[PDB]
Design a protein around this ligand. Structure first.
Ligand SMILES: [Cl-]
Ligand SMILES: [Cl-]
Lengths: 154, 154
């Protein structure tokens, strides 16, 4: 893989690109996953946890996954990148600059994700790289979760 | 508890405050909780899951919780508000405009949260309010999670 040093600022900035990575592997968001997240988080809203009622009453025709559940299931998905950042002492998940849930993930559907570097800035503590992560229902062109992840290189 | 009508934008805008609500109840972020989130999300980084290696090699001297784990545990924390928004048909968790993890939650520590309304805007769909949510280790003045929630009253 191409190697980019966090010390070579102008090289880090070249990674800013509008084209997304290839797709990642696929993960099934089962009702069992949804129910476990509901108990772990405390969010047991019926549109996520009540299949019988959601079939009859939900705008979506079935239960759907929590937005924040799909967000954290990104760690099940390996995004293939053709490059590798090096020459940092440490790498940190600094949070996010944007979280959106444009479309729902129906219970039982698979998700996959792709990404691109949306911005690169030098901060006091190092280099902040913003990676736009899009998580989709497999076969759905509109994202279900958008996450402008902020990575801090130190 | 006062009632603010989503049809009265001057009354909605008057919720904007630099001061936070009272504290919520407390919740224990045990190693068992951290381990389960590791399995559910797929994030098994040793700083969260490996006490022994953490004791000797972790910059924190022990395991800590995933930032996104503390984030989703907000649904365990009931924030007492002195008001209630009404006169809407639907409320939507539209996402977030800022997520940060300023300080870590050591395994076995308790957390609690408070919040304030950061901004209120009229939108085509209805009224957008940004609520700053702060989740802390009980007794720590620095937040462990900052989450600027975006709420859409339709
Ligand atoms: Cl590239
Ligand atoms: Cl920042």
């Amino acid at each position: 893989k191409r190697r980019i040093s966090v010390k070579d600022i102008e090289a880090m900035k070249s990674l800013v690109s509008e084209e997304y990575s290839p797709w990642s592997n696929e993960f099934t968001v089962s009702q069992e996953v949804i129910d476990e997240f509901a108990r772990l988080s405390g969010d047991d809203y019926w549109i996520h946890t009540d299949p019988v009622q959601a079939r009859e009453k939900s705008p979506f025709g079935t239960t759907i996954a929590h937005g924040a559940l799909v967000q954290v299931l990104a760690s099940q998905l390996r995004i293939p990148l053709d490059y590798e950042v090096v020459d940092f002492n440490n790498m940190v998940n600094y949070g996010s600059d944007r979280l959106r849930f444009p479309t729902p993930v129906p219970s039982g559907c698979k998700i996959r994700a792709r990404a691109r570097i949306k911005a690169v800035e030098q901060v006091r503590s190092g280099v902040q790289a913003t990676m736009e992560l899009n998580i989709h229902v497999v076969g759905q062109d509109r994202p279900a979760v958008i996450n402008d992840l902020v990575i801090l290189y130190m």
